Amino acid sequence: GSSGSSGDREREQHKREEAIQNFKALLSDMVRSSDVSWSDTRRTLRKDHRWESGSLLEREEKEKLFNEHIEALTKKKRESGPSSG
């Protein structure tokens, strides 16, 4: 079908989707490090502006995202404990 996307085919979900991606990006930008704890993070994000819209994601959802973002970062880190299977 037409490559270009247009129309109000998907608005409901879309609304949320935006929050999801936006949340992740905000985590990397704000929390670029991986040596931090959820508590501190959440509190910090709670002050951010975008966070407002992030409300969509339930406490659990948000917490999960952050954690995942951290573990992922370390992986990139050149020097890091022996992680294999």
Swiss-Prot record:
This is Transcription elongation regulator 1. Residues 16-72 form the FF domain. It comes from Homo sapiens (Human). Detected in brain neurons. Induction: Up-regulated in brain tissue from patients with Huntington disease. It is found in: Nucleus. It comes from the Eukaryota. Binds formin. Interacts (via the second WW domain) with TREX1 (via proline-rich region). Binds RNA polymerase II, HD and SF1. The chain holds residues 888 to 959 of 1098 of the full protein. The FF domains bind the phosphorylated C-terminus of the largest subunit of RNA polymerase II, probably mediate interaction with HTATSF1 and preferentially bind peptides with the consensus sequence [DE](2-5)-[FWY]-[DE](2-5). The WW domains bind Pro-rich domains. The modification Phosphoserine is found at residue 53. Transcription factor that binds RNA polymerase II and inhibits the elongation of transcripts from target promoters. Regulates transcription elongation in a TATA box-dependent manner. Necessary for TAT-dependent activation of the human immunodeficiency virus type 1 (HIV-1) promoter.
